[PDB]
Amino acid sequence: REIITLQLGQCGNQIGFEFWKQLCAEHGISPEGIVEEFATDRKDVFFYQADDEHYIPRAVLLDLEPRVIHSILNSPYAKLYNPENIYLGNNWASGFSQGEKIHEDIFDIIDREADGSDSLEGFVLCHSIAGGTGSGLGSYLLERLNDRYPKKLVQTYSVFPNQDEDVVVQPYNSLLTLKRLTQNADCVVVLDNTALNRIATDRLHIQNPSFSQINQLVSTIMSASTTTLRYPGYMNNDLIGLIASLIPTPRLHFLMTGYTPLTTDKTTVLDVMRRLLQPKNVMVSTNHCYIAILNIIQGEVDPTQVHKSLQRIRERKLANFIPWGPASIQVALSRKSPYLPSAHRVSGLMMANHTSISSLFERTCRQYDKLRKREAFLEQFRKEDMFKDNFDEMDTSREIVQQLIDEYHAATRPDYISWG
Amino acid sequence: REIITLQLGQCGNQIGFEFWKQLCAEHGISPEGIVEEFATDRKDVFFYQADDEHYIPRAVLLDLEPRVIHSILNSPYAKLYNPENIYLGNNWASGFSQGEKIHEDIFDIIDREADGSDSLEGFVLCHSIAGGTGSGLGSYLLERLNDRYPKKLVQTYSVFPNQDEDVVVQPYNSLLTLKRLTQNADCVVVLDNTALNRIATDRLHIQNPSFSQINQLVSTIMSASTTTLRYPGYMNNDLIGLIASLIPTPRLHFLMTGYTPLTTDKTTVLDVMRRLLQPKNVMVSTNHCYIAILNIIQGEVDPTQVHKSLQRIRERKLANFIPWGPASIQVALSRKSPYLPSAHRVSGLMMANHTSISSLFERTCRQYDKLRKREAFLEQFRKEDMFKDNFDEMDTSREIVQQLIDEYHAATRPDYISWG
Amino acid sequence: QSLSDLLFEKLGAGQTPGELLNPLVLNSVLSKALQCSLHGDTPHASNLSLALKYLPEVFAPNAPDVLSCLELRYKVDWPLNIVITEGCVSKYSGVF
Amino acid sequence: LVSGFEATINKFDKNFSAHLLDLLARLSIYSGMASVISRLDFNGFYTERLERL
Ligand SMILES: Nc1nc2c(ncn2[C@@H]2O[C@H](COP(=O)(O)OP(=O)(O)O)[C@@H](O)[C@H]2O)c(=O)[nH]1
Ligand SMILES: Nc1nc2c(ncn2[C@@H]2O[C@H](COP(=O)(O)OP(=O)(O)O)[C@@H](O)[C@H]2O)c(=O)[nH]1
């Protein structure tokens, strides 16, 4: 079934704008939305088919008090995305309240696309955590979607924000988002601003314009995570089959990301596989262990190398994991596209369930716990107090995320057979 | 037999003026009605033949309190339509009374053409519902025609008016027109001002001059609805032969429209069919379902593709009839004309009996019911009161249209075998 | 996934006494599967047939079709009839 | 019209249906060629009345 992407918030709208542009050039598409003449791939899932080959992405763009939003509209690709479905604070509470009054028109825009498609399998959100308007509005829309569309499976390309710690309420906003995400997301793929900023400092000298350049890094991961779905394959063609292996227990649905070519701008599989297990290529910042690992390689890979390669990574043990889940690394292979350059034709990515990401969740919980005692930034803005007089959703969120922090470490232990 | 079109009222006279002009260029005719030197079609039905190839269509132009009709006369096409048959309020009652005094001279103008033709099969009215002068005069002339030609059949290109709701008596005028139209019209083809205005906003930026541009949209549908008759074919070479499939029960004789390329300014048959069933291509604004669907395609269509196209549509189920009968999508095919542009080499239209149109009838019945209680606009004009002191034709109309509203929903039910 | 999918709903759902072996349903699903594959509609898609060999008395508990004899049959042209031997395509069926 | 017309119609309706189901059944036995039966009930009206044997 076709996938509908609910890109929301200024930050989320920036990475959806680029992700669709990335699949414009990668696929046989043009800024008008029509196919290029020069142009064997499965464009049905991601791109709606118009009568005159105007393959329009099924993007849902949500904006709130737009000013810099108009920049997406003044672009050569404005015609490419024309489902004609765009509808008009820095606080999590401020975003949640604004979403509630406009919920029905934004929800009808969801319906239109659902009716238009032959079918709808999942809602992929370009979510921004502690995103000012992006968070709060995104949590609320996350709660409505599961109730209305229980059958579908949701994913979140959460850009978890770590900038070395401006938002003084950033921990409070993030704390609330996770309680909803844990509760109302079937899957989440985690990314980190600092981890990518550190990569940007590593591969390039770019430091001050970190957000503009890092957009390309988030994009390469995003296009890559779905390339097996976008291009024809003998296995995991459906999104669901892919999702099951990466998330073995429902609560632990957060996925770590890595790219074998930190710089993609021959190499045998035995090599490309080993790079994913080096921490310099990872993009995320008591014993600790992965729960299950998966990898997808691109290009005309030599296959015999993989049997040697898979048995080879095994002797290397570069990846240390002994979870409750069996955790064999899974090997996938896909075709690099026939439009984009063949430089570094072989290039890989890995998506894995790792207990280390628990540490990133605890750090915002640490900032929040410190901030909660001080009550330095309760906002006490009338919106914040009137929306939350008890201020007990933050405590409800704190116990739910602490259960998550606890569950992760329970995964490390030998007995996750018992309740976690 | 030749078809005589009784275009009446300023709005109706505007769409007949254009429809005849549209078949002027489409057929081999100049603005003086002369056979074009540059020029395989059956012109006998729509165009009378003069000895010097003067193709004067059998148009009957009725002008009441003329203003627009003065402009039709100052046109290059004034010579093209010269049967020399044009004869001299905003209330339905005001129009009906004016028609009654001049009924015999307008009726002799009908006779002249009937005598002149080898034969006469149907009277096609460019009717305007709640058209001020156009309604009331049109209802009365609708009643006289059936009595005089009991064997003959009457069609109505009703431009049902929906402008988001100026006429304060618009619901009252429309209410009366339908009662006459339900019992005294063999067929009716429904169009909607708002539905077309929404299409105008969609395909173009035109908003303020909605009436002038929408005339072209009503015309393309009108020329197209007759192209199977105007050009010879294996099947559907008689009006009546075509009318039977579209109207299965006499009461439900209202037909919905659609055009696969609203932007007509290659495509396989499988594509042009699927595009049409989508609701953006439709031009009309409890379970609900079609009673029987039909489609006609004019372009470079492969013959064997169409029988495969029907199978593909059956699988897509984009629309399901689910009626009491064997109603099936019916594929029909015609020749696009030479001389005029062949853009959208393949381009289609659909005429269908749909229970959704009941909703549009109920909305004017809703405005009227609300208006009837208030009695805000009883007119009480002496014409209105003297013509209708009891004001019980409106109630007679209300029960007849309510029977129609009821019959439609009965069609949706599993038992229309029982009385509806 | 599709040819197997429609059949599975029916096989598990019921029609277990070879009511899923109606030549009509078998052909209907096959054409449906071929059309909906999206890899393509080709002169190559011709010679594709959905068929059965051993006849099931009834489908068993768990609807295993553990050896369900549904044989995909492929016709071969005269010259390549020599290149592709009947025994050879007999083997091809096994993986299916 | 209420009774005498209905009396003529019911016998013809049964006879036409009998001459119609026997025909579609005797056409269903044969193996484009089957596009005949698929098109005749494109909605699924009288999708199946009597399963033969
Ligand atoms: N990855 C990425 N993150 C961004 C970018 N711009 C802003 N952000 C993140 O967006 C978050 C704040 O959201 P904000 O821009 O305030 O949303 P707003 O309230 O709509 O302005 C911060 O956590 C930033 O890390 C960008 O270009 N790339
Ligand atoms: N489709 C279409 N409808 C029109 C146009 N002009 C007027 N109408 C319709 O005509 C109706 C009113 O008729 P009117 O023009 O008042 O007739 P008059 O009494 O002769 O002026 C309204 O319901 C309009 O929707 C036109 O150019 N196109």
Side-chain angles (χ1 to χ4, degrees), chain A residues 32-43:
Chain A
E32 299 78 17
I34 186 167
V35 54
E36 293 279 27
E37 162 279 319
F38 62 78
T40 58
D41 46 7
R42 176 193 205 187
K43 285 165 82 188

Side-chain angles (χ1 to χ4, degrees), chain A residues 48-53 82-83 112 118, chain B residues 260 266-267 271-272 275 278 280 316 344:
Chain A
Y48 179 96
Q49 179 72 289
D51 171 79
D52 185 20
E53 279 63 64
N82 211 77
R112 171 148 87 270
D118 163 75
Chain B
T260 278
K266 280 65 170 179
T267 58
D271 271 34
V272 299
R275 179 60 178 163
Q278 297 160 15
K280 287 190 174 183
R316 304 162 206 280
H344 257 284

Side-chain angles (χ1 to χ4, degrees), chain C residues 16-28:
Chain C
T16 41
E19 166 187 348
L20 188 37
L21 303 169
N22 305 341
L24 60 101
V25 66
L26 295 171
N27 176 52
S28 73

Side-chain angles (χ1 to χ4, degrees), chain B residues 9-11 14-15 64 67 89-90 128-134 159 161-163 167 170 193 196 211-212 214-215 218:
Chain B
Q10 285 185 354
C11 166
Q14 291 150 39
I15 57 157
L64 176 52
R67 188 275 314 282
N90 291 335
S128 180
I129 303 266
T133 64
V159 284
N162 180 16
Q163 314 97 317
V167 191
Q170 215 184 102
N193 272 110
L196 297 168
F211 287 124
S212 302
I214 283 169
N215 283 128
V218 162

Side-chain angles (χ1 to χ4, degrees), chain C residues 20-90:
Chain C
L20 188 37
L21 303 169
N22 305 341
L24 60 101
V25 66
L26 295 171
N27 176 52
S28 73
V29 295
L30 173 81
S31 32
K32 179 59 163 60
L34 292 161
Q35 278 296 341
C36 303
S37 78
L38 300 187
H39 184 282
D41 301 338
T42 56
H44 300 281
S46 78
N47 311 2
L48 272 275
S49 295
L50 206 76
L52 74 102
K53 180 223 296 172
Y54 157 78
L55 184 74
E57 71 288 345
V58 61
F59 320 150
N62 321 136
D65 276 22
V66 57
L67 295 174
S68 166
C69 280
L70 185 165
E71 281 61 36
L72 276 285
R73 310 290 191 176
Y74 189 78
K75 166 268 169 190
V76 281
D77 184 27
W78 142 247
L80 296 322
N81 173 23
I82 295 148
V83 173
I84 310 296
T85 299
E86 287 73 12
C88 313
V89 277
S90 203

Side-chain angles (χ1 to χ4, degrees), chain A residues 81-100:
Chain A
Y81 48 92
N82 211 77
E84 190 253 312
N85 60 347
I86 307 96
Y87 192 91
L88 278 70
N90 291 335
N91 296 102
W92 177 99
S94 76
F96 189 105
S97 44
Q98 274 149 23
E100 178 66 74

